[PDB]
C-alpha cells in the first residue's frame, strides 16, 4: 500500500500535489500543464514547442550560460516535453536541492526572455528537426496517423508545426501564448519522492504565487473531434521494415469505457520476436504472429485525450510477402472481442492490469508522471482501490458490448511506412473488420 | 538492505511502502568468470527456460496471470535475474528461482531454437549503437582476458550446450549466489528462501582464470553503421575520485536544448557530436573511459583532440566551484544508481558476493580540487591508453596522435 | 493416434505383471512377423512424419542420427523396388532397434499439449 | 631490356626467339598513389572495358581470333596490364593499350554491373588464404597511409564513378606510363608506340599523399575460415642485405615432403604450420615480414616464440656455410623474379618510371655473414614491432608476448 | 521495331534540309495530337518495357530518374482511371519532354547487336 497522494492549493487557484518516499533519496519536482499544441490555431502551431527550446535559452536574471552552470552545481537535471494536450517540465534533483530546482523552474516559465537574437537562433535548430524525425518510424508513424484520422482539426497538427511558421514565428506571439494558457488553474506543481508536501506548497508559495488567473476557470482536463477514416500509405521499397498503424476512433480519459477499452487492448496485447517469454504469451494474435513469423513486434495502444481517443495497434514486420496475412489476423483477432471472447480472456487481461498499472510506477520520475497526468487529465488522483473496483466492474458483455459499437464494422485510420506493396487497398483491410459468419 | 544468511545464501532485503516487490537473483557469473567466450551471455539467457518441475511455457502463462516481469542482464561480474510482482506473489517468484537454479534442464533445441537466436538479437541490438561497441572494444584491448572477455554471445565463437551446463555447474551453488528483495519484507524472505534454496549444491567460489592484467592500444572495429571512439586509461588501483572526476569531464547536458558547462560538453561546439566520461571500477582494476560519437569522422577527431586537452587541463588546476560542481554531480549519479533496480540489485550483489560495503549516496567523499587535478594528471599521463575507434577507422584518430 | 497416448497406455501394461505376461511375448512375435527388421528399418523409421509435429522432432535429432536414419530410408527404398530382402549386417538386429525418435517427439508433443491446456484456462 | 623514349613514353623491350611476346603497360597508379580507398584496384578492373572506338565485347572476341590473353594486377606501386600474343600480332596490342589510356568510356552500369562485382570476387578469393589478409594487416598497421592504404577495393568504402574517372584522369599519362616488352623487337615497339600514344595527355607524375610514416602496433581480424599470424618489422632505410636475410631465414621446403634446414622451416617440426620470411622494399620505406599459418592457434603461438628466437639468434651468430647458403637462395629468388613475366614489368617499371636501376640477378651481392648478423640485430631491436592476428585472434599471440 | 532503327532512320531526316523542313512540323503537330503531355507523360514513358533489353536499360536508370519516372507512371494511371486530365504544373510542357531513357536503351542495343554480328563472324 503506496503512501497517500497529499493535494492542496494556492489562492491564483494553483494545485500542488505530492508522494513522498522515504526510501529513496532523490526527488522529482515539476509543473505541469493542461496545455500543448492543440491550443495553437494554424498560424501559429508549432509556438508550445518553440516555447519549450526558449525556456532553456536565458531567463531575465540567468543568462543561457548562467542557467547552465545553476543546473549543472544543482547536480541533476532539468527535462521538459510537449504534447498535443499536456506541457512538462520538472527537475530532477537531489533531497535537499529541492528548493534550488522549483526556483529555477519558476523562473524559466515566469521570466524568460525570448529575446530576437534566441529566437532567429532556434529557428534554425528547429528548421533541422524537421529533417530528422523522418529516422524515428514509430513517431513518423503516430503523426501521420494523427493528422489523417482528425483531418484538418486541432488534434491532427504535429507539435513541431509547418517549416513556414517556424520562419515567422515572433517573441510577440510567443508571449502571447504562453499567456493565455500558462494560468495557474491549469497548472499543477508536482513532487515525488524525498519531498515534503508542506515544504512544496510554501516553495510554491514563494515562487508561483504571482501566476495569472484564467478569466473563466474551467475544471483540470476540461476540453468537437470527427474521425476521419482514411489512409496515408509512404511506401520506401529501399527501407527493410515496413511499419503500419491501424486504429479506430477510441475513448476520452473520462469515458465510461476508459477501463473496458484497456482490459480489450490487453487482450490483444504485445509481442516483439527479441524479448525470450514472448514466443510463450497467451494473447491469440501473439500465437499466430509467432509461429508463422509475420512480425518483428506488435505493440496495442489505446491513446486517450480530453474528448477523444485513438485505439489500435502498431506492427512492425520484414516479412513484405505476408504482410496481407498479418493485417487479416491481426484484425480477425479484433473480430473476436465482439463475437467470441468470454470470461476466459477477460479475467486474464484484468489480471495482468491490475498488477501492470501498479507494475509502471517504479521511480520518482514515473510516479511525478502518474501524479501530474492524472491530475491535469481527471482532476484527480485516483486511489489504487479505485482502480482496482473500476477494473474489477469489467466483464466479458462490457467488452463484447464495447467492441460491438467500436471496432465492429467501423472505419479505420491506417497508416503504412517502407515496404509497404503487400498492403492491400483500404477496403480490403476495412472488410476485415467484420466477418461474414457472424 | 538488510543483509542475513539463509541456509548457506546471503539475501538482503528492504522493506518498503508500495504494493510492487523486486526480487533478483544476482550470481557470480559475469563475463570475467566465463570459461567460454559468451556463455555468460548464453547462461543468462537460458535463465527461465524448461525446469524439470515447470516448463517455460508453462511459467509465462502463469507470470501472466500475477501480472509480473522478468528481467535479465549480464555484466563482467555478474547475472541478474530479476522478477517484479505485486507484494503478496513473493512465494511464487521465490520457488521459482529455486526451479532455475536446481532443475534447469538445459535442452539442445532450447539452445538451438530459442536461446542462441535471442542472445543474437540482443548483441544486434546493442552494436546498432557505435558507442557501445567501441566502449566493449577499449575493454578488449586494455585487459585481453578476464574482464577483456566479451560479454556477449558472438558468432564467431559459438558456444555449445556442454560449454553452457559446465559454466552453470559452477556458477548455480550456493556459494555463487546472492537474493536481493527491493520492497520485501526481509524476515519473510528469509524463511522463504531458506526452504527454496536448501538443497542448492554448496559448489564453490568461481574464480577469474588468470589475474587482471593491463595493456595499452589500439582497436579499429571497421562498421558502415556509425561512428564512435573511445579514449580509456585503464587503472591499475580504483580509487573512488574517479565517479568525482568522470562527473566532473562530464559530456551529457542536464538541460534540454543545450549543450552544458562540462568540460567535455564545451568541447562539442559547432558539431554534431556527443561525449560522456565514465570510470567503472572492477575491484582490481578500472577503466576510466571518454566516448564520443558523432556521424562526422572529421568532428569526433575534432572532439578527440579537445577532450584529451580537457583532461591535461584538469591535471593543471581545478576551481572549488567546480570541485563542489563535482561532489553534487557525483552524489546525484550515486543516489539515481541505487534506485535503478537493475544496478541497486548488482550493487548488494556485490556487498554480499564479495565483501566491498556500499557506499552510500549520502557518504560519497567530497574531493578537493588539490585531489581532482592529481587524478587527472594521472590519467594524461598513463604510460598505456587504449583508443578504439569504430566506423570510417581509416578517418579516426590514432593513440599516438592524441 | 499421438505417440504420446501410445507410450502412456504402453506403460500401464507394462506396469501391470499379468497384462505384461500376456502383451509382452505377443508384442515381440508381432514385430517378427511386422517384418521391418528385413528391409533394415528401425521401428522409428515408420512413423508418420507429415505433421508439423513430427518435422519439428526431426529437426530436433542430433545430426548424426538424422543421416543416419536418411540412409536407411534410401537403402530400405531400393530394396522395396528390387524386390529383395536386407541380408547380414543389413538386417536390424532387436538390439539396434532403439526408439531414437520417441524422446524428441514426446517433447514436442507434451508442450503442444500443454499449450492446448493453458489456451483453455479460467482464473478461478 | 634496351630502355628507350617513345613520343614522351619510357619504352623497354628485349628481343628474344620464341614466338610469344608480353607487352605491359606499367601504370604509376598502385594503391599508395590512390586518392580513395580502393581506386587503383578499380582502374585496374576498368581496363579493357568499353572505349569509344572498341567496345569490351569487341575486343575480348577479337583477342579470342589471336589467341592472346589478358593479365591484369594492383601492387601497392603499380597497376599493371599485361597482354600475351604471338610476336606478329603486336601492332593490334599496342593500339588496344591507346584505347584504353586515352578513350575508356568510364560508364555507370560496367562500375555496377561488370568491375565492382568482379573486384569483389577477386578480394574474396584472395582472402580465402588467411595468410594473405595476415600481411595485408600488417601493412597497414605499419605505414597506416600511402603504403598502409588497402590494395583491394572493399565494401565498406565504395569507390564511385567519379572518383574511378578522377584519378584515370591523373594516372592515364605520358608521365605515368612505362610500356615493357618482353620477346619484343625494341626497335618495332619504339615506332608503334610513338604513333599511337603520341596524343596522350603528358599530365603530371602522380604522388603519394604525405611521406610514408612508420608505427608499431597489433592487428587482430576474427574469421572463422583459419589462422595466420603476421611480425613485421617496418624497416626506415630499405637495404639490399634484408633479401639475404629473408631468404636465409627462409621457411618453405626446397624438397618434396621435406621440411627445410632454414631456420624457419625448423620451428614448425611438430606442427602443420608453415612459415615464409618476407621482405618488401617499397623504396622508401621497407617491410620485413614473417608470416605463420596453420589450422591450430596453439601450434602457430608455439611456432611464433621460436621465430622470433631465430630471428634473436640470427642476430647473435651466422656461420660461413649459412652466409654463402643465403647469397644462393637469394641469387636464385632474383633470377626468377626477372624470368616471370608479371614481376619482370614491375621491376622494370620501377627503373622507368621511378628510376631505381635493376639489379641484375647475377649481380646479387655477396654478404659476409657479420652483415647478415648485423641486420638481423637491428630488427630483433626495433621499436616499432607490428603484428596482425587472423583467425581466432583469443587464441594467437600478441606483440607483447613476442 | 528496334529505338535504334527509329533514331537511325530519324537521323537521316534531320540530315536531310528538304525532308526536315516538311517533317519536322508534321512531327510536332503528331505530339499535340498524341495527348500524352496531357496526361503529364514525357515520351519515353511510352515505350514498352517488357522485354530482356528494356528491363536493362530502366535498371540502368539513375535512381532519381527511376523514381520520378514511377511517380509520373502512377500519376497518369490515376488521371486515367479518374477520366481526367493533368492541369497546371502536372501537363508536360515541350522543354520537361526530355528523352531521359533513350541513350540507356542506344546502349543495350548497341552491345546486342553487336553480340549477334561477332556470333556470325567468319574468319578470313
Request: avoid cysteine; charge should be negative; proline fraction near 4%.
Amino acid at each position: 500500500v503506496s503512501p497517500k497522494t497529499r493535494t492542496s492549493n494556492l489562492k491564483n487557484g494553483l494545485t500542488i500535489a505530492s508522494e513522498s518516499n522515504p526510501l529513496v533519496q532523490t526527488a522529482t519536482v515539476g509543473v505541469w500543464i493542461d496545455a500543448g499544441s492543440r491550443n495553437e490555431n494554424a498560424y501559429n502551431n508549432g509556438t508550445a514547442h518553440f516555447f519549450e527550446h526558449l525556456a532553456f535559452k536565458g531567463t531575465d536574471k540567468r543568462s543561457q550560460h548562467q542557467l547552465e552552470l545553476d543546473i549543472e552545481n544543482m547536480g541533476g537535471h532539468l527535462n521538459a516535453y510537449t504534447s498535443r494536450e499536456s506541457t512538462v517540465y520538472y527537475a530532477k534533483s537531489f533531497k535537499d536541492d529541492v528548493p534550488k530546482s522549483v526556483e529555477i523552474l519558476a523562473d524559466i516559465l515566469q521570466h524568460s526572455k525570448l529575446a530576437e537574437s534566441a529566437i532567429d537562433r532556434e529557428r534554425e535548430v528547429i528548421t533541422r528537426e524537421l529533417e530528422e524525425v523522418n529516422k524515428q518510424y514509430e513517431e513518423v508513424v503516430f503523426d501521420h496517423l494523427h493528422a489523417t484520422a482528425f483531418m484538418n482539426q486541432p488534434l491532427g497538427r504535429t507539435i513541431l508545426g509547418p517549416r513556414e511558421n517556424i520562419q515567422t514565428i515572433t517573441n510577440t506571439e510567443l508571449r502571447k501564448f504562453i499567456t493565455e494558457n500558462y494560468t495557474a488553474d491549469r497548472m499543477v506543481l508536482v513532487g515525488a519522492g524525498a519531498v515534503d508536501h508542506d515544504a512544496l506548497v510554501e516553495l510554491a508559495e514563494k515562487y508561483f504565487s504571482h501566476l495569472p488567473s484564467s478569466q473563466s476557470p474551467v475544471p483540470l482536463g476540461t476540453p468537437i473531434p470527427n474521425f476521419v477514416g482514411s489512409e496515408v500509405r509512404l511506401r520506401d521499397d529501399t527501407m527493410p521494415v515496413a511499419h503500419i498503424a491501424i486504429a479506430v476512433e477510441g475513448v476520452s480519459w473520462t469515458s465510461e469505457d476508459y477501463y473496458t477499452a484497456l482490459v480489450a487492448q490487453a487482450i490483444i496485447g504485445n509481442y516483439d520476436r527479441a524479448v525470450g517469454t514472448s514466443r510463450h504469451q497467451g494473447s491469440r494474435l501473439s500465437n499466430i504472429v509467432s509461429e508463422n513469423n509475420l512480425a518483428n513486434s506488435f505493440q496495442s495502444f489505446s491513446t486517450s485525450y480530453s474528448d477523444t481517443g485513438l485505439w489500435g495497434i502498431y506492427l512492425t514486420s520484414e516479412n513484405t510477402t505476408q504482410i496481407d496475412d498479418l493485417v487479416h489476423f491481426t484484425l480477425k483477432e479484433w473480430n473476436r472481442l465482439s463475437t467470441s471472447v468470454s470470461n476466459l480472456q477477460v479475467e486474464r487481461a484484468k489480471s495482468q492490469l491490475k498488477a501492470g498499472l501498479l507494475l509502471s510506477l517504479d521511480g520518482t520520475t514515473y510516479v511525478a508522471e502518474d501524479i501530474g497526468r492524472q491530475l491535469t487529465t481527471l482532476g484527480r488522483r485516483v486511489t489504487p482501490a479505485e482502480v482496482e473496483a473500476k477494473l474489477e466492474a469489467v466483464t466479458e458483455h462490457d467488452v463484447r458490448a464495447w467492441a460491438q459499437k467500436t471496432l465492429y464494422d467501423k472505419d479505420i485510420a491506417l497508416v503504412g511506412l517502407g515496404p509497404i506493396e503487400g498492403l492491400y487497398d483500404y477496403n480490403r483491410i476495412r472488410n476485415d473488420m467484420s466477418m461474414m459468419r457472424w | 538492505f538488510s543483509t542475513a544468511e539463509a541456509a548457506g545464501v546471503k539475501v538482503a532485503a528492504q522493506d518498503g511502502q508500495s504494493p510492487i516487490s523486486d526480487l533478483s537473483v544476482v550470481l557470480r557469473g559475469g563475463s570475467r568468470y566465463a570459461t567460454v567466450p559468451g556463455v555468460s551471455h548464453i547462461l543468462e539467457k537460458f535463465a527461465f527456460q524448461n525446469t524439470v518441475p515447470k516448463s517455460a511455457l508453462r511459467f509465462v502463462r502463469e507470470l501472466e496471470l500475477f501480472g509480473g516481469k522478468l528481467y535479465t542482464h549480464t555484466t563482467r561480474e555478474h547475472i541478474v535475474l530479476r522478477t517484479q510482482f505485486l507484494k503478496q506473489d513473493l512465494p511464487y517468484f521465490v520457488d521459482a528461482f529455486a526451479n532455475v537454479l536446481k532443475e534447469t534442464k538445459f535442452q539442445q533445441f532450447e539452445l538451438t531454437e530459442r536461446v542462441a537466436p535471442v542472445a543474437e538479437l540482443d548483441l544486434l541490438k546493442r552494436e546498432s549503437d557505435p558507442a557501445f561497441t567501441a566502449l566493449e572494444a577499449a575493454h578488449e584491448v586494455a585487459f585481453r582476458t578476464g574482464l577483456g572477455n566479451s560479454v556477449y554471445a558472438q558468432g564467431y565463437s559459438p558456444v555449445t550446450l556442454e560449454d553452457v551446463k559446465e559454466f552453470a555447474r559452477q556458477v548455480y551453488a550456493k556459494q555463487n549466489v546472492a537474493v536481493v528483495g527491493n520492497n520485501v519484507v526481509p524476515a519473510d524472505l528469509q524463511q522463504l528462501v531458506g526452504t527454496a534454496f536448501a538443497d542448492l549444491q554448496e559448489g564453490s567460489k568461481v574464480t577469474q582464470a588468470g589475474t587482471t592484467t593491463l595493456h595499452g592500444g589500439e582497436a579499429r572495429v571497421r562498421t558502415s553503421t556509425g561512428n564512435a571512439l573511445t579514449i580509456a586509461l585503464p587503472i591499475a588501483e580504483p580509487k573512488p575520485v574517479y565517479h568525482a572526476l568522470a562527473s566532473f569531464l562530464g559530456g551529457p547536458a542536464s538541460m534540454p536544448w543545450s549543450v552544458g558547462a562540462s568540460p567535455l560538453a564545451q568541447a562539442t561546439v559547432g558539431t554534431h557530436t556527443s561525449v560522456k566520461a565514465t570510470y567503472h571500477n572492477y575491484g582490481d582494476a578500472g577503466l576510466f573511459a571518454i566516448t564520443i560519437k558523432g556521424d562526422s569522422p572529421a568532428e569526433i577527431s575534432q572532439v578527440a583532440h579537445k577532450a584529451v586537452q580537457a583532461l591535461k587541463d584538469t591535471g593543471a588546476e581545478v576551481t572549488e566551484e567546480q570541485a563542489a560542481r563535482a561532489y553534487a554531480k557525483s552524489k546525484f549519479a550515486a543516489a539515481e544508481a541505487f534506485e535503478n533496480p537493475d544496478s541497486s540489485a548488482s550493487v548488494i550483489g556485490m556487498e554480499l558476493l564479495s565483501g566491498v560495503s556500499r557506499i552510500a549516496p549520502e557518504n560519497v567523499q567530497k574531493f578537493t580540487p588539490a585531489e581532482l587535478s592529481e587524478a587527472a594528471a594521472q590519467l594524461s599521463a598513463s604510460a598505456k591508453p587504449v583508443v578504439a575507434a569504430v566506423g570510417q577507422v581509416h578517418a579516426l584518430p590514432f593513440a599516438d596522435e592524441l | 493416434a499421438s505417440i504420446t497416448s501410445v507410450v502412456k497406455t504402453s506403460e500401464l501394461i507394462l506396469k501391470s505383471p499379468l497384462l505384461s505376461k500376456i502383451v509382452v511375448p505377443l508384442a515381440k512375435t508381432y514385430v517378427k512377423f511386422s517384418g521391418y527388421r528385413q528391409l533394415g528399418f528401425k521401428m522409428n523409421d515408420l512413423i508418420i512424419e507429415e505433421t508439423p509435429n513430427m518435422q519439428l522432432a526431426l529437426r530436433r535429432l542430433p545430426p548424426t542420427e538424422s543421416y543416419d536414419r536418411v540412409y536407411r530410408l534410401i537403402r530400405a527404398t531400393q530394396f522395396s523396388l528390387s524386390h529383395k530382402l536386407a541380408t547380414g549386417n543389413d538386417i536390424t538386429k532387436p538390439e539396434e532397434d532403439d526408439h531414437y525418435l520417441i524422446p524428441y517427439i514426446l517433447d514436442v508433443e507434451a508442450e503442444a499439449f500443454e499449450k492446448d491446456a493453458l489456451d483453455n484456462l479460467e482464473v478461478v
